[PDB]
Amino acid sequence: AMANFEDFLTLDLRIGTVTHAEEFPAIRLEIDFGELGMKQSSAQITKRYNPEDLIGQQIVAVVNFPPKRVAGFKSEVLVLGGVPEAGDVVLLQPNMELPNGTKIS
């Protein structure tokens, strides 16, 4: 099914840096989005990522959806990844460091 570019333009895709990560199947993240401030995300990225690995990792997120609660944790942004098989995620990242809050287009 063909998509509308104006729907893409409604999305706010940003770069942010992971500043905290914790696991108690998801990882709770806090992420620095620059002028947008700090935001939380819950990400089902336990297949490949250990919370230690992630501090200072730059990610790509959609920042302007309504929040959702995952096991009580407020997830405010949707962190984007490729899914080559069910349960598996590889994070997207910029190829070079960018300023936090950089817009994607």
Place this chain on the structure above:
Amino acid sequence: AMANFEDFLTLDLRIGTVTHAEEFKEARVPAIRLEIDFGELGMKQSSAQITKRYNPEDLIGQQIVAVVNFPPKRVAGFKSEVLVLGGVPEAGDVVLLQPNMELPNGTKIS
């Protein structure tokens, strides 16, 4: 302004690998013309205004992220079939998105 998740679900974002790249002028703007392998979707062509930070040589074999289900974009005879995504920290400056680890071409993004 707040976006609807259902609208996001209409988009088809995919990983592809650049197999060929050439510097050219798109409507008198320096750009790189890319041929990109999207796995099950096959080969697609795109133009990207990425000359600030990229040269054709170092793009070959690189994996990128693109939206593949928009109508094609045409500029001055050049059809772009996918939108290659990048961060734009200032005018003229593009840093490409990439997967953090290797993925099969055509892998879907969510």
